[PDB]
């Protein structure tokens, strides 16, 4: 599917195998939340992103 819809002209299509354990996330791998413990602002947070 990813090879097929790699040249899709309207948006993005991504196929991800489901996470091994239900309820521990929406996909397998790593989950990281990039916080702003100081209040740098939305633009600064996107910059860090």
């Amino acid at each position: 599917v990813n090879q097929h819809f790699a040249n899709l002209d309207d948006g993005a299509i991504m196929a991800v195998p489901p996470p091994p354990v239900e309820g521990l996330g929406n996909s397998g791998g790593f989950a990281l939340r990039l916080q702003d413990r100081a209040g740098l602002g939305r633009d600064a947070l996107l910059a860090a992103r």
Binding site: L8, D9, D10, G11, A12
Partner: peptide, 27 residues
């Protein structure tokens, strides 16, 4: 109203997957 001239080849697809200056294939 401005910034376009007749005959300009504008891309109307895959705008989410193109960066400035990247090479693309017209259809």
């Amino acid at each position: 109203s401005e910034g376009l001239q007749a005959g300009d080849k504008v891309i109307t697809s895959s705008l989410a997957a193109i960066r400035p200056g990247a090479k693309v294939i017209p259809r």
